[PDB]
Amino acid sequence: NDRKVYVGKVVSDKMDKTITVLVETYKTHKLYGKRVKYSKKYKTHDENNSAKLGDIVKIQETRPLSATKRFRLVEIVEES
Amino acid sequence: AVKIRLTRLGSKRNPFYRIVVADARSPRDGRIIEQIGTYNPTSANAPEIKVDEALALKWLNDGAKPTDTVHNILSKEGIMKKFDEQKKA
Amino acid sequence: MIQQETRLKVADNSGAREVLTIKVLGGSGRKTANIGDVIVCTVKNATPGGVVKKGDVVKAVIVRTKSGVRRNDGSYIKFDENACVIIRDDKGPRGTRIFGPVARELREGNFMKIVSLAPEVL
Amino acid sequence: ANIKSAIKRVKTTEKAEARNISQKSAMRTAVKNAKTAVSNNADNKNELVSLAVKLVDKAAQSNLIHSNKADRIKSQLMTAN
RNA sequence: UAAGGAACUCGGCAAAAUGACCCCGUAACUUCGGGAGAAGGGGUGCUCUUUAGGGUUAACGCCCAGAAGAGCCGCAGUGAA
């Protein structure tokens, strides 16, 4: 099989090998049918502090590597 | 252990039995794995056994045990006779 | 030695946690009490609920004084606090869950129900 | 209201837990010193390890310990040795 | 000074109890200053290590230890006032 393959945008590269991407998509409203953007900070596991703030990063899910990060990095489409 | 059973449907004084391969620890009228066919004692003359015998042999070859009445149902059609030729070959 | 205005812990689930003595009943001029002596007393700290409430005047028997009793064989017994069981004017208690050790010297005062509802009697 | 089977199960679980903690403490003792004997480069660095790896699957073919904690203990000994 | 603990008494009068230092917390109400050391708690001996500040300085040393572990002893470690 294969795992989910989301793409996003980093928000805060803090210390110690962790970045947090921002996958933004468009849920529709239930009753009125208006599209609305919403955000989802997905913590992910950088290998060696590679990606910097401002980059758009492709990610993939993995086994739970910590309490709140579940995802890993695969590829960086653009950076700053 | 999985075992082919009889889950009863139908009303009072009118039993209708569907035959079911299910786990032995589920309840009688509860969750099932697959529903093979039916069985109806209170019809006109027959018991009206319907069994898709291509699928009942998929369970008998990996641990399903008939329990004393579906073993009569499968023998009435002839699944249990034809079950030996997989073991004989 | 338990006289007027001594605070005693209440040693059952009768609804009281602390109680102070009004009089030591018995005779006239009777000053002190020990194990087996019935005292009339007002509860000061009461459990919310139960039977008795703060400001009731109850009768109650002394169990386990701090200055305990002497026995016929020259033996003594002493306890670390003064305790008390609220009774129901037939030498029978209010509660069913008497707490703490009870002195032996109230078996002979017809408080057998208090003994049977208690822990190990010494 | 004790059913008359459960009064026999409380008996046979005291009889069966005494045999367990005798064996289960022996497996934890025999790896407490063999992991010490992997350190210090002592004499029985190939004899106590053969005793420790022995007892941690005497207690794994029986259901004292699970067969993945057995392999986790005997890898913490034999890697460091 | 047993036991009790304001029952004394016109009235807690007197006596008792509180107190040092450090740390933690400190309410109603306010004229915003206060209240407030509110209350309420906790710690304190000695010995050995660790480094550790103030600098004393050629510095660790001189000098208060900046603090943490470890150990010892008594009923009790601002052990008296």
Next chain:
RNA sequence: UAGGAGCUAGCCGUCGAAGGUGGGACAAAUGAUUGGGGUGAAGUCGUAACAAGGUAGCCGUAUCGGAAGGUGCGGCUGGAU
């Protein structure tokens, strides 16, 4: 002799439910008495609005009055020429 390997029981201190206190927060019930409202029948007293309703009304604000209301200042026409 039995002893060593162990093991058990016990003992030592870290974590631990409940309980003990302590000050606040929050929530609920109750409380002598209390002040507005609603509704009723009217005990009783006025006439403020509606006709330029007896001094055009109304809005904001200050003050006065037992209240209805009155007055000053500004605004409005949802008023009279």
Next chain:
RNA sequence: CGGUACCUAAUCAGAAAGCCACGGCUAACUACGUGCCAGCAGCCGCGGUAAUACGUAGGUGGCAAGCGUUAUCCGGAAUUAUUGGGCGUAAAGCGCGCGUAGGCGGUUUUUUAAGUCUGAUGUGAAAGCCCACGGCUCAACCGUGGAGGGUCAUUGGAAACU
């Protein structure tokens, strides 16, 4: 279960109806009693001496082993309105500015495929709802075969519109 379901004979019009409404909504009314009293009332409202609205009696009607009241829920209610409402005076425009986030945004070309559309699967158990047969003496009910999973995910494509 159970001498139960059921089937054969024997006898008898035997023993087997009430319940709420009657003004107008709402198809069913006349007469006595009572005379703002006793009382009714879902709404509007009936009663003070000729009450089709009160109380009873004869009628009639709704429908029936039930009938009526009450409680709660949805509908009627377009009285929360996306479908499908409003804001001069009926309830409703902040006393007006500057602006953050957000929402929305002129024309053309190339382009991508998030939204969008389209077709390949897989799945959204059984029971029920709808449809068609079968078994109940009919019906309730029960069983079997079908709309069918249309919510979603995986996979190709389309490129106008965001």
Next chain:
RNA sequence: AUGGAGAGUUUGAUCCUGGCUCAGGAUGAACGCUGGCGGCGUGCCUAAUACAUGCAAGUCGAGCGAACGGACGAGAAGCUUGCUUCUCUGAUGUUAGCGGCGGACGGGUGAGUAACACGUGGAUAACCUACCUAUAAGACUGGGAUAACUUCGGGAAACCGGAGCUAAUACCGGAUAAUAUUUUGAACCGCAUGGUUCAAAAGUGAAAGACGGUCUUGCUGUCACUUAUAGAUGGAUCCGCGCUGCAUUAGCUAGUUGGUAAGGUAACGGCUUACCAAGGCAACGAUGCAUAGCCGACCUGAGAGGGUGAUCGGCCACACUGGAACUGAGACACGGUCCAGACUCCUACGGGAGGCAGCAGUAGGGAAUCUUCCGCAAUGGGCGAAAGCCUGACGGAGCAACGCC
């Protein structure tokens, strides 16, 4: 596309806005009046309040010691020449124990939980799985122990606390084989990483019962045994979305967010403990308080949508209240243990016990909701070669116009 109506009411009289009140459906309904039945359903919604009594989880002698009962070979004969005195081959029957397995399913309830609890769709190159089925390889050689029983003491008791014996498919020691594990090579992926041959060192099992035929034997069929693979099953964790009312709740966190180690878990991980770093979440509603098991479904509506969770299924949570571990494949366990607490019960006062939110039933609450019934014959479940036993699951009977026909 078989799919949508209305009326009354502000006024002296209209139009409009606008609420109110009806006509229609349903219910776990209740109450009043009345009441032949029959068939299918349904029947504590309140107090997750307390419970008298039976009674719901047992089974296996073909795992094996004992026991007990008793036929059958049953002497001499008390001569009552059949009563057995005892003796016995003991056939065979029954159980109080040891042991295996089941007690984790079935059954009940909805208190807690706004949460990966649930629904839906995924992921596990981070997972475990007794019985069942399939495939092979095995089952060798020894040992001591302890209930029962006998004896003692405490207790009127029931059960503790001693002393000495005994058996096993109980327990334990030793041999013999692994694709486990740790060291070295050759493929492919989606980051750690996998799969499939290799090749070296250490490590680890066990059970006999009841048959058959024949050799005073030695192979043997049935099903237990344990070893390694699979399959089937059941379980676990993680993730995307979908999840009530309040902002008259706006700052929440401090193992909290990462790191590097170490332990430990079936398994990944702040899961836990050390140090290092200051992060983490939040107006897209963190947090806080309040309310509520969720869904299939059911009721209603022309739809959009609203309402509900009785019954019937799926899942979760709980078992007087709060912690904890043991046994076991599986529990941190509804008719198991330990501890703490609140109640309750027996008592010779020496210490003992119990948990109906199982099935009927009682009291209490309430407008309101039933028999202390029959049966394992059906289907299902447990233990057994099996007969069979146990099954308040279930199949039926009873009461109630509660509903439908």
